[PDB]
Amino acid sequence: YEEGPGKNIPFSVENKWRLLAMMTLFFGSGFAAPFFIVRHQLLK
Amino acid sequence: YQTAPFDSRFPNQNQTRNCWQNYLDFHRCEKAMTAKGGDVSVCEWYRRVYKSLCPISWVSTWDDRRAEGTFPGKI
Amino acid sequence: YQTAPFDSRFPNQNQTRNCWQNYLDFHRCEKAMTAKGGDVSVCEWYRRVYKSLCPISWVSTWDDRRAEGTFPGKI
Amino acid sequence: MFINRWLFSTNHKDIGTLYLLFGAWAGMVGTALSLLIRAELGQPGTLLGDDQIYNVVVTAHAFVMIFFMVMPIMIGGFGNWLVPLMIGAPDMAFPRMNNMSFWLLPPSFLLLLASSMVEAGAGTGWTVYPPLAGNLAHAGASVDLTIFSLHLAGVSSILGAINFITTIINMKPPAMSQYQTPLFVWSVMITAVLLLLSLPVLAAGITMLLTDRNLNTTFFDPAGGGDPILYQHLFWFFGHPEVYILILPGFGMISHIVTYYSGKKEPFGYMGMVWAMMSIGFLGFIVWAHHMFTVGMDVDTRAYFTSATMIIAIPTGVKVFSWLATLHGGNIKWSPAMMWALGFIFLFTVGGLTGIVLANSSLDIVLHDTYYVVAHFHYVLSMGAVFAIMGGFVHWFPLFSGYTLNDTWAKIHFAIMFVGVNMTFFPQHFLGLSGMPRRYSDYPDAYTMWNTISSMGSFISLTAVMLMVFIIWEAFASKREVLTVDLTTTNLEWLNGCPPPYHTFEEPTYVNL
Amino acid sequence: FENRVAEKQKLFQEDNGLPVHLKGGATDNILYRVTMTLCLGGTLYSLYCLGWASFP
Amino acid sequence: MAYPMQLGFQDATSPIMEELLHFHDHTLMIVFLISSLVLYIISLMLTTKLTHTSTMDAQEVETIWTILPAIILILIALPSLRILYMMDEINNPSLTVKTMGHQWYWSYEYTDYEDLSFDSYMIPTSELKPGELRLLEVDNRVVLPMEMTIRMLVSSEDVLHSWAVPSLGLKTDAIPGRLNQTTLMSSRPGLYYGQCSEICGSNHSFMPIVLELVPLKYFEKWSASML
Amino acid sequence: QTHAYHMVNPSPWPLTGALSALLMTSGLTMWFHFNSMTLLMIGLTTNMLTMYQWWRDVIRESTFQGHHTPAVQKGLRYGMILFIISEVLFFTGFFWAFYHSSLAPTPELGGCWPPTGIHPLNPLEVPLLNTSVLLASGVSITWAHHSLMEGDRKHMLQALFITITLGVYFTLLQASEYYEAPFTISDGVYGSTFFVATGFHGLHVIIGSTFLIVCFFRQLKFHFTSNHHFGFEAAAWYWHFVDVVWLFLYVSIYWWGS
Amino acid sequence: GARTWRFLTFGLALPSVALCTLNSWLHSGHRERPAFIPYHHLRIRTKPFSWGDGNHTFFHNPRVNPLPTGYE
Amino acid sequence: GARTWRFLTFGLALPSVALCTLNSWLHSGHRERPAFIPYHHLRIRTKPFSWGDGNHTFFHNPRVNPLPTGYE
Numbered sequence A: 001y002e003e004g005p006g007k008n009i010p011f012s013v014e015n016k017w018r019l020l021a022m023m024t025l026f027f028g029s030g031f032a033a034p035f036f037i038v039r040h041q042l043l044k
Numbered sequence B, C: 001y002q003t004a005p006f007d008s009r010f011p012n013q014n015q016t017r018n019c020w021q022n023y024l025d026f027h028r029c030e031k032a033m034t035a036k037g038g039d040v041s042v043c044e045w046y047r048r049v050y051k052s053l054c055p056i057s058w059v060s061t062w063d064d065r066r067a068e069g070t071f072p073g074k075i
Numbered sequence D: 001m002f003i004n005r006w007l008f009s010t011n012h013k014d015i016g017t018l019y020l021l022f023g024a025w026a027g028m029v030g031t032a033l034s035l036l037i038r039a040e041l042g043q044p045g046t047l048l049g050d051d052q053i054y055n056v057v058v059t060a061h062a063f064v065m066i067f068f069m070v071m072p073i074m075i076g077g078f079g080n081w082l083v084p085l086m087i088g089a090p091d092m093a094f095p096r097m098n099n100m101s102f103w104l105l106p107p108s109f110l111l112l113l114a115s116s117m118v119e120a121g122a123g124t125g126w127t128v129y130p131p132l133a134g135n136l137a138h139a140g141a142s143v144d145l146t147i148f149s150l151h152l153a154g155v156s157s158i159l160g161a162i163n164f165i166t167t168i169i170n171m172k173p174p175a176m177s178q179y180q181t182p183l184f185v186w187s188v189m190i191t192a193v194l195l196l197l198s199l200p201v202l203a204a205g206i207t208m209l210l211t212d213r214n215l216n217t218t219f220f221d222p223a224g225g226g227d228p229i230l231y232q233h234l235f236w237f238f239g240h241p242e243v244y245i246l247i248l249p250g251f252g253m254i255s256h257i258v259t260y261y262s263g264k265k266e267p268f269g270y271m272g273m274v275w276a277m278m279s280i281g282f283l284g285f286i287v288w289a290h291h292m293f294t295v296g297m298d299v300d301t302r303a304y305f306t307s308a309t310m311i312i313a314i315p316t317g318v319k320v321f322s323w324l325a326t327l328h329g330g331n332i333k334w335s336p337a338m339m340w341a342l343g344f345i346f347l348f349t350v351g352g353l354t355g356i357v358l359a360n361s362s363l364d365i366v367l368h369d370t371y372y373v374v375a376h377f378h379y380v381l382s383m384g385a386v387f388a389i390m391g392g393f394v395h396w397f398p399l400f401s402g403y404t405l406n407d408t409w410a411k412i413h414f415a416i417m418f419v420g421v422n423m424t425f426f427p428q429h430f431l432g433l434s435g436m437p438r439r440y441s442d443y444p445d446a447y448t449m450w451n452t453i454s455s456m457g458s459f460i461s462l463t464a465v466m467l468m469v470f471i472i473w474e475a476f477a478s479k480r481e482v483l484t485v486d487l488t489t490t491n492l493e494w495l496n497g498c499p500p501p502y503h504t505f506e507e508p509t510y511v512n513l
Numbered sequence E: 001f002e003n004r005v006a007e008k009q010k011l012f013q014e015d016n017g018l019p020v021h022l023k024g025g026a027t028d029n030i031l032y033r034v035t036m037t038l039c040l041g042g043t044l045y046s047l048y049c050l051g052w053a054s055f056p
Numbered sequence F: 001m002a003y004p005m006q007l008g009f010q011d012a013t014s015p016i017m018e019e020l021l022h023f024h025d026h027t028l029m030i031v032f033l034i035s036s037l038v039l040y041i042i043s044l045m046l047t048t049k050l051t052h053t054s055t056m057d058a059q060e061v062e063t064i065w066t067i068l069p070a071i072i073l074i075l076i077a078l079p080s081l082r083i084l085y086m087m088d089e090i091n092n093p094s095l096t097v098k099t100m101g102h103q104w105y106w107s108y109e110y111t112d113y114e115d116l117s118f119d120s121y122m123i124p125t126s127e128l129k130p131g132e133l134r135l136l137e138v139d140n141r142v143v144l145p146m147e148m149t150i151r152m153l154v155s156s157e158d159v160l161h162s163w164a165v166p167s168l169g170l171k172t173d174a175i176p177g178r179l180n181q182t183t184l185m186s187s188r189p190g191l192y193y194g195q196c197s198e199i200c201g202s203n204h205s206f207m208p209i210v211l212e213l214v215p216l217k218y219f220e221k222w223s224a225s226m227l
Numbered sequence G: 001q002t003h004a005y006h007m008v009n010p011s012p013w014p015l016t017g018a019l020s021a022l023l024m025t026s027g028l029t030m031w032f033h034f035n036s037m038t039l040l041m042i043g044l045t046t047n048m049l050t051m052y053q054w055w056r057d058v059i060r061e062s063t064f065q066g067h068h069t070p071a072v073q074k075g076l077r078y079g080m081i082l083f084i085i086s087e088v089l090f091f092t093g094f095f096w097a098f099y100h101s102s103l104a105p106t107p108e109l110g111g112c113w114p115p116t117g118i119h120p121l122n123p124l125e126v127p128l129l130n131t132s133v134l135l136a137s138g139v140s141i142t143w144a145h146h147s148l149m150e151g152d153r154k155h156m157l158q159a160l161f162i163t164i165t166l167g168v169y170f171t172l173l174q175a176s177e178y179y180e181a182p183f184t185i186s187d188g189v190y191g192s193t194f195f196v197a198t199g200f201h202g203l204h205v206i207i208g209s210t211f212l213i214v215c216f217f218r219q220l221k222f223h224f225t226s227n228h229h230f231g232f233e234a235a236a237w238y239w240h241f242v243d244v245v246w247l248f249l250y251v252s253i254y255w256w257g258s
Numbered sequence H, I: 001g002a003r004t005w006r007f008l009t010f011g012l013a014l015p016s017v018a019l020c021t022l023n024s025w026l027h028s029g030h031r032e033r034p035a036f037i038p039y040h041h042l043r044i045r046t047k048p049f050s051w052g053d054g055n056h057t058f059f060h061n062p063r064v065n066p067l068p069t070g071y072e
């Protein structure tokens, strides 16, 4: 296995903009989920 | 008679057993007084106390079960 | 009435509690009936059973203690 | 190689990283739920138009924050990363079982999010009291999916507790006694003992609820001779230990952080700190019925539970004064982690003190099931746990990643979060004293001003959360690689560099007698 | 029965780079593939069931 | 009832709520002082260039840190428990009233003498009479005599509820199959409000309690009228 | 390495175990609510496959590869004791439910224990026999332990076979008891406490018996040495735990509760 | 030693099981079933069981387990 | 080790004794003695005691121990 800074993680930090997209999708998906579950329950 | 007095047998916040015991006592006494054709006025203290303490729905359910033969207390 | 029947509460050789329970039941019933000035005849079953089962000296001692205020059972 | 490393892990560091990622994601969910709560309450009337959905949101908010954010971050994340490093151990005792404690949590979370998506959700409160949680008042699958979520979370934490206790007892250097282990390691061992003893009792109680819902048992159903209050005893027998479980690793991290940024080699009064954590753990099992002062128990029982509960203040005060005495005479480094730790000491103290108010059963009659209780636990638990987590996170991020944070950004983040949580929760004391019930979707008009302010506070904390994500991005984006840190002589977890190699302590430390 | 532990020691200590769950031979591969296929397929089926149950 | 911008407890309507106010004042003074001391000491520890980083002996100071908190806790517990045992003390009630919780309203039973019972529902906002209080009014108030010891018995016909009246110091859970007792004594006539205080499902926020306290003569006239 | 601890090969079984838990729980949900056993039978199958391969690998790592040094064995000892402690606390919850219900019988029961209409089993008939069976199996497993320590293959196998036979006898007696019982799990809190507490105990007897059967086959294949046999020790500890829980059930539910 | 524990196994433990087996087998006769009474605290049905017709317990014995409506 | 048992002595055991001493201290003070009733199962005298006047128990407390004839 690869060792050292940026290599001990399951995501790439090779490109800061690809990283920004992945972090956006990751934390954004979690934050969004309760709003969409509330929407799902209301639309019942 | 105004209301049921303090009963040292049932001194705590949970009064469930106080309602139950007076309901049993009234119906045991009523059965005892009827069976010799005696006088149910002797049972009056228990009647007033259970009527004061017991929820109407508990009394009504217990009455129904006595009539059904499914009342689980001994009378 | 010939004698006290079999009582499933007291099925064993030791009949002490049978005598004791019917003596208590008679005196409780008698107190309940005398206080309203009702009729002690409704208590008669307990009277016949304790008189059948209980030794004379036990009854005599218990009566003396009720009169003295030293009877340890609840009536 | 990627599947072998990240799905098939037997490495304490990689499993710790998985727990930190999981917990951070869970924190976003929990935060979103908290903002939906405060949006419903932020003006008088109804926002969602569906009070069952409000009750589902409140219930999910608590389960996510407790089971999927705090415990995974503190025990699974910091515990797995730091405990083996702090005792010079090559891994956990059961490195493969460790991986299953982690992989049980995504399924557990999926069951919770299934509960909320089927039928009308579990609008029960995180207490899940019958008969509201029973098969009449909550017919259908939602409550059963919540029960199963808690079974999987419980198995994860019981197996984790076995792993941590075994590791800490069995895998120190042969010369190192228990009284030569760092306070964070003590805090995890004690937490693990509480989990091992408390979770099985919760498992029994929620299993009884499952069977009352599906197999026609009547543990909690008076028609069959059961008792809803039995459920409450079994739940709280777990639930009081659980609140000490949530804070104890936090107390351990605070001890390390205060010692480190005071420039000290050691915390003040080490054996007193061990004594205090063990005393809190023990007393934590004999106080549960202070959650039940209004259910109708006997006066002498209320008197006992008041008195026993108040005792916990004594060992707790020893820890608070010991942290102050660790600052005393320090060469203070005003790092962002130090700011988190000082915020912790003060905000934890405020919440602990409102706990002592509530311990008085007489006054609890009026405060029970009001916003006073919500205020108490958002100080001691919500702020205490979160401030300890953020202090540990900014302190140890460079160890785990190999990269430095921007300290000025981290200080801005602290300042925003401090304002937001105090604006959110301080006014809830007034709402409680003035009689506003908890678990309400709307309130009498008199309560409008403090609800409005509380909801405005909740948005300030949201701004802090968003900024935290940017700050982590900026550290990974800039790639400032750590060279040196100070005080390695009394902080062994740093001595293999940043990040440490996949395998550390292949050659164990040398410690003589 | 005879003590064949030494023969198993030799098999499981062979320097072939295999992880312990595959070191017994081709049968380990079959049992792993059956297990993982049922787990992953079952999980996809559980998500389908969630989708179905999420609506009236 | 609560009023806008309220910081503390509703004004006491019963002697036991008065006791709780005095006890809270005592306890809050301690909370303030300890909170303030901790903040002050943090500020003191952080505001000197002087240093002492060598090992410090903890034994002497830990005596102060355990004895002083133990004394403070005793000084809170003594009055706390005095009030606890006052709120349990044998009273001779002159009246017993039952309340049953339901999803989502209260029923009341006055069965000392007559079988009087009725249901008590929140007045919807669209039906409030001018000047009436949103989420707090009911159709049928709990009429009770003032300056008299009353026994309230609390249960439920469905899920858990909790019968509360803050200004009287009252909160008693409503548990099906259980009959919980509390004592009510109002020093004053008037209207006293409370709200369901155990989560009982979608309309938990909307099943309030309203007591109407009147002189005995008016309570008797009301009872007699109900025949 | 120059430490004595075990760095475990990367393994799929944690993930297959975690997914088996999802399938069993989602499966029970789909059985109780959506009239279907499909997910549940997949979950039970993957759970058994996971436990088989995981413990097979522990045998490979120890008997075949030599990774269980004394330090590793010491850790497993602690792990098994802590696991038993967690199981004690799980049962404690069921005993608490039993004592809560039986010490304060509610009016719905007739305000008595046993409730009106409940006819308990005679604790001097099959329950006493079950007691003699598990106590006897505690003696036979101790004989097995001493035989193994003394290097006696034949007597270890005979003693362990007798222990397993007694566990199976208990299980068949309890199955028979369940079928003959005139009360059911739906007979109020008496049936609830009886069947859930004795049913989790019966499950633990089946688990313990299975563990003894694994030890029997490992012994037939000469895995254990006279000094190194932690799987046997753990199975004996677990078996003693099952015995002791039975004695508490017998005294509490069958005897005192009759 | 092993010899002592074998002695206890064959000399005390298994004899005990044989005597309890004889005791049980002598008392194994079918008891006369009690009159059915539809008590509301027994034969609980809050949800149908997930097997059979929903109204039979898992190890239902027609001889001794009445349904809510009585013996089959 | 000795260190751990000293830790338990001073950290758990003696604090427990201090708390129970506090508890007993707070609930001390004389309760009102009950009306004398000459129950025949109490104040047993089948033989005089071998000390004093034969009618006083060994640790007789005049405040709370009545004689067969009542309080002194």
Ligand code: HEA
Residues within 6 Å of the ligand: D243, D244, D246, D247, D290, D291, D309, D310, D312, D313, D316, D317, D318, D320, D348, D349, D350, D351, D352, D353, D354, D355, D356, D358, D359, D360, D364, D367, D368, D369, D373, D376, D377, D380, D381, D382, D384, D385, F034, F038, F068, F069, F070, F072, F073
């Ligand atoms: C981190 C989590 C955590 C922690 C540590 C605590 C700590 C305490 N809690 Fe709290 N509590 C919760 C989380 C927590 N709590 C939660 C989640 C609930 C609600 C559950 C629900 O209903 O959903 C709750 C509810 C709860 C109740 C029930 C209230 C009700 O529902 O009506 C009570 C009752 O006594 C209680 C008391 C305390 C006490 C006395 C402490 C003590 O341990 C505090 C000790 C600390 C201090 C006292 C401050 C430091 C001390 C000093 C500076 C020394 C000097 C001090 C004195 C002399 C007083 N809390």
Ligand code: HEA
Residues within 6 Å of the ligand: D020, D023, D024, D027, D028, D031, D034, D035, D037, D038, D058, D059, D061, D062, D065, D066, D069, D070, D073, D124, D125, D126, D127, D374, D378, D381, D382, D383, D385, D386, D389, D390, D393, D421, D424, D437, D438, D439, D440, D441, D454, D458, D461, D462, D465
């Ligand atoms: C740990 C526990 C915890 C945390 C953190 C929180 C956080 C918050 N909670 Fe609360 N909450 C509970 C536990 C918690 N809560 C519980 C147990 C209940 C009772 C439920 C019931 O009644 O049944 C409750 C209920 C509750 C209510 C009462 C609802 C009602 O009675 O109707 C309210 C009302 O305002 C509220 C608000 C908030 C807000 C605004 C936040 C936050 O927005 C405050 C700010 C904190 C954050 C935003 C978190 C930041 C952390 C991360 C994002 C993790 C980062 C990760 C890494 C760095 C690795 N919550």
Ligand SMILES: CCCCC/C=C/C/C=C/C/C=C/C/C=C\CCCC(=O)O[C@H](COC(=O)CCCCCCCCCCCCCCCCC)COP(=O)(O)OCCN
Residues within 6 Å of the ligand: D151, D154, D155, D203, D207, D210, D211, D215, G171, G174, G175, G178, G179, G180, G181, G182, G183, G184, G185, G186, G195, G196, G198, G199, G200, G201, G202, G203, H057, H058, H059, H060, H061, H065
């Ligand atoms: C012979 C000795 C032992 C036998 C073992 C039992 C066989 C079937 C099931 C096995 C699992 C047992 C565990 C205990 C769970 C609950 C009930 C089991 C007790 C039992 O078998 O009771 C039976 C009922 O079973 C029923 O309802 C049906 C039960 C089937 C479905 C149970 C589903 C519930 C599973 C709960 C999961 C909880 C897991 C906890 C994990 C915690 C981790 C933290 C009794 O039969 P009856 O006809 O009512 O009365 C007899 C009348 N002649």
Ligand SMILES: CCCCC/C=C\C/C=C/C/C=C\C/C=C\CCCC(=O)O[C@H](COC(=O)CCCCCCCCCCCCCCCCC)COP(=O)(O)OCCN
Residues within 6 Å of the ligand: I057, I058, I059, I060, I061, I065
């Ligand atoms: C702090 C407590 C420690 C105890 C020390 C106190 C007393 C002397 C020795 C005690 C030995 C123990 C038991 C002997 C029997 C009786 C004493 C019981 C304990 C006691 O001291 O009982 C007292 C009575 O003592 C009495 O009769 C006094 C009786 C004195 C004579 C005792 C007769 C000796 C009996 C023979 C012993 C036989 C031993 C056989 C050994 C076996 C060989 C096979 C109680 O006082 P009280 O006024 O009735 O009630 C209190 C009212 N306020």
Ligand SMILES: CCCCCC/C=C/CCCCCCCCCC(=O)O[C@H](COC(=O)CCCCCCCCCCCCCCC)COP(=O)(O)OC[C@@H](O)CO
Residues within 6 Å of the ligand: G051, G055, G056, G058, G059, G062, G063, G068, G076, G080, G206, G207, G208, G210, G211, G214, G223, G224, G225, G228, G229, G230, G231, G232, G234, G238
């Ligand atoms: C029809 C059946 C339906 C029921 C299915 C449910 C499951 C039943 C499973 C029964 C458990 C079987 C466990 C087998 C373990 C085999 C591996 C083993 O025993 O491994 C041993 C280590 O122990 C170790 O890991 C110890 C491992 C401890 C395992 C503990 C197992 C108890 C598990 C209970 C399961 C959860 C139940 C909870 C439910 C509420 C290996 O070391 P040694 O023995 O020293 O050998 C080495 C020498 O040869 C060197 O000379």
Ligand SMILES: CCCCCC/C=C\CCCCCCCCCC(=O)O[C@H](COC(=O)CCCCCCCCCCCCCCC)COP(=O)(O)OC[C@@H](O)CO
Residues within 6 Å of the ligand: D093, D094, D095, D096, D097, D098, D151, D152, D155, D158, D162, D199, D200, D203, G006, G008, G017, G018, G020, G021, G024, G025, G028, G047, G050, G051, G054, G057, G058, G061, G062, G067, G072, G076, G079, G080, G083, G086, G087, G090
């Ligand atoms: C509704 C139904 C919901 C229930 C879902 C069930 C949950 C999950 C599915 C379970 C899948 C189990 C698969 C087998 C797990 C075996 C674990 C084990 O045996 O772990 C061992 C450690 O735990 C030890 O000993 C002692 C610990 C052994 C524990 C065995 C497994 C227990 C699982 C359930 C327990 C619940 C406890 C009940 C109390 C509440 C070995 O540790 P490893 O790190 O592997 O290796 C270390 C090497 O040095 C060995 O050579």
Ligand SMILES: CCCCCCCCCCO[C@@H]1O[C@H](CO)[C@@H](O[C@H]2O[C@H](CO)[C@@H](O)[C@H](O)[C@H]2O)[C@H](O)[C@H]1O
Residues within 6 Å of the ligand: E037, E038, E040, E041, E042, E045, G034, G035, G036, G037, G038, G039, G042
């Ligand atoms: C190897 C990886 C694993 C892959 C997963 C396999 C997926 C199998 C899909 C089959 O789906 C089934 O369809 C049945 C028929 O449509 C359903 O029957 C049930 O549903 C019926 C609906 O008609 C009812 O009559 C009954 O409850 C019952 O027969 C049953 O619920 C469902 O499972």
Ligand SMILES: C[C@H](CCC(=O)O)[C@H]1CC[C@H]2[C@@H]3[C@H](O)C[C@@H]4C[C@H](O)CC[C@]4(C)[C@H]3C[C@H](O)[C@]12C
Residues within 6 Å of the ligand: E001, E002, G153, G154, G157, G158, G161
């Ligand atoms: C002949 C054979 C030798 C085993 C060996 O050393 O390989 C013996 C030794 C002990 C025997 C076992 C034990 O005697 C106990 C059991 C006795 C039963 O009558 C048959 C099965 C039973 C389980 C036996 C099977 C088999 O005959 C074993 C295994």
Ligand code: CUA
Residues within 6 Å of the ligand: F101, F102, F104, F160, F161, F162, F196, F197, F198, F199, F200, F201, F203, F204, F205, F207
């Ligand atoms: Cu009724 Cu809340």
Ligand SMILES: [Cu+2]
Residues within 6 Å of the ligand: D239, D240, D243, D287, D288, D290, D291
């Ligand atoms: Cu608590």
Ligand SMILES: [Mg+2]
Residues within 6 Å of the ligand: D294, D368, D369, F162, F197, F198
């Ligand atoms: Mg409540």
Ligand code: NA
Residues within 6 Å of the ligand: D040, D041, D042, D043, D044, D045, D046, D047, D441, D442, D443
């Ligand atoms: Na609202």
